[PDB]
């Protein structure tokens, strides 16, 4: 990473040009060029590159990814004093606190809403159960009721959670990672409803973000499900839209997972002070947030002074009504496993590769299996290393062999062990493999 410049990654659905405007203000005032990039799959690319000391100085994503980044040592602990922390809502700081340390700056609170075309649909449905018949009526006029991104489970989650699906059970401030709610009766009921819509040709399994956005913005579908960022392109399209509460399912509110868009500093950045100056003094100001927001709306921002303005917008009132019916995501490392497993279940059930029951059963099994193996691997390395530091060689090596046994490609692990273990002990270990 280059000293004396800032490189920023943010997702391509957000106001990256507006963020670049903040970057030009920063460059005007300071030495310092700010390059804003929006790589594809940045939330996967970041841990790959930052593990080698490469990547952006600053990473923007929802807070759910950040505990895993911090666990891997990829993020700098951030350094705001009390006066600065008091400028943002306390719950936003909670979202970026991990093992007692703040690991990112909160920017804005994101929740999905139902977005509808008021000319096609002056009174939108209050329930999921109403959607099939509405679709049939719209299909007779060459329209459809609903299109949204089925390829990312973020957009189907509110329906899965409605009647009781959950990721990891909340226990008095902590998440219980042994208590997974992906294959429960409520999760199965909501996904079954979505998959029946598809079976009966009221929705297409292949619909993705850009298909749905184009359909809505061209006046072809009466409804979509999307976040605040999407409102700019609908403005440009001139569709007469409303933003409202998500439909209920079996009388229960849909429960979106709420994201706090957050900015982390790469642990390998040589520009940590410049990143702090940019984030605290340029971005997290009314003017900085306004520049980004004008490009693509942020949602409900973390910065009190600017949020006090935005709450007057009826679209933000709707976003907050949906947020309050949902739950703030965990930031724990296990979120990555959850999302990969549920993504697979949704796609497989929607496509007919699996039944809903089998898809979610398998997702639950995959999450719990991944977490059990990780737990065992880490515990056995620790225990083996601890026993070696005490001179019980035989028992120490036996535990290290158990960890290696549950690692399919142990070359990197063996390189790490070769750096810490005395050579005679590493040699002993090699003979057990």
């Amino acid at each position: 990473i280059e000293e004396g410049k800032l490189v920023i990654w943010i997702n391509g659905d957000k106001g990256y040009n507006g963020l670049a405007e903040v970057g030009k203000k920063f460059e005007k005032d300071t030495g310092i060029k700010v390059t804003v990039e929006h790589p594809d799959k940045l939330e996967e690319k970041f841990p790959q590159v930052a593990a080698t000391g490469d990547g952006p100085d600053i990473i923007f994503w929802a807070h759910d990814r950040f505990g895993g980044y911090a666990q891997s040592g990829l993020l700098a602990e951030i350094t705001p004093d009390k006066a600065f922390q008091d400028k943002l809502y306390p719950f936003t700081w909670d979202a970026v606190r991990y093992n007692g340390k703040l690991i990112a700056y909160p920017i804005a609170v994101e929740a999905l809403s139902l977005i509808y075309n008021k000319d096609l649909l002056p009174n939108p449905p209050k329930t999921w159960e109403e959607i099939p018949a509405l679709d049939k009526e719209l299909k007779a006029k060459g329209k459809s009721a609903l299109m949204f991104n089925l390829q990312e489970p973020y957009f189907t989650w509110p329906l899965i959670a409605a009647d009781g699906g959950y990721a990891f059970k909340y226990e008095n401030g902590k998440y219980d990672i042994k208590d997974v709610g992906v294959d429960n009766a409520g999760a199965k009921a909501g996904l079954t409803f979505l998959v029946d819509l598809i079976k009966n040709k009221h929705m297409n399994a292949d619909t993705d973000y850009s298909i749905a956005e184009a359909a809505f913005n061209k006046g072809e579908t009466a409804m979509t499900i999307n976040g605040p960022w999407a409102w700019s392109n609908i403005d440009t399209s001139k569709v007469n839209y409303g933003v409202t509460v998500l439909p209920t399912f079996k009388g229960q509110p849909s429960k979106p997972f709420v994201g706090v868009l957050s900015a982390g500093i790469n642990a390998a950045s040589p520009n940590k002070e410049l990143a702090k100056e940019f984030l605290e003094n340029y971005l997290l100001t009314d003017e900085g947030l306004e520049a980004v927001n004008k490009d693509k709306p942020l949602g409900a921002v973390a910065l009190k002074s600017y949020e006090e303005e935005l709450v007057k917008d009826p679209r933000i009132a709707a976003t907050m009504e949906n947020a309050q019916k949902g739950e703030i995501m965990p930031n724990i490392p296990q979120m990555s496993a959850f999302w990969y497993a549920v993504r697979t279940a949704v796609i497989n059930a929607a496509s007919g590769r699996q039944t809903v029951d089998e898809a979610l059963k398998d997702a639950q099994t995959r999450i719990k299996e991944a977490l059990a193996v990780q737990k065992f691997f880490l515990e056995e390395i620790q225990l083996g290393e601890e026993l070696l530091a005490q001179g019980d060689y035989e028992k120490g090596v036996d535990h290290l062999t158990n960890a290696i046994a549950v690692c399919g490609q142990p070359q990197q692990l063996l390189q790490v062990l070769q750096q810490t273990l005395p050579p005679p002990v590493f040699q002993m270990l090699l003979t057990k493999l």
């Binding site: 891997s72 040592g73 490392p333 496993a337 790490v416």
Partner: peptide
């Protein structure tokens, strides 16, 4: 951090 970087969803 060093041991956590050896793991992914896909495996080790």
């Amino acid at each position: 951090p060093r041991l956590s970087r050896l793991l992914s969803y896909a495996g080790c």
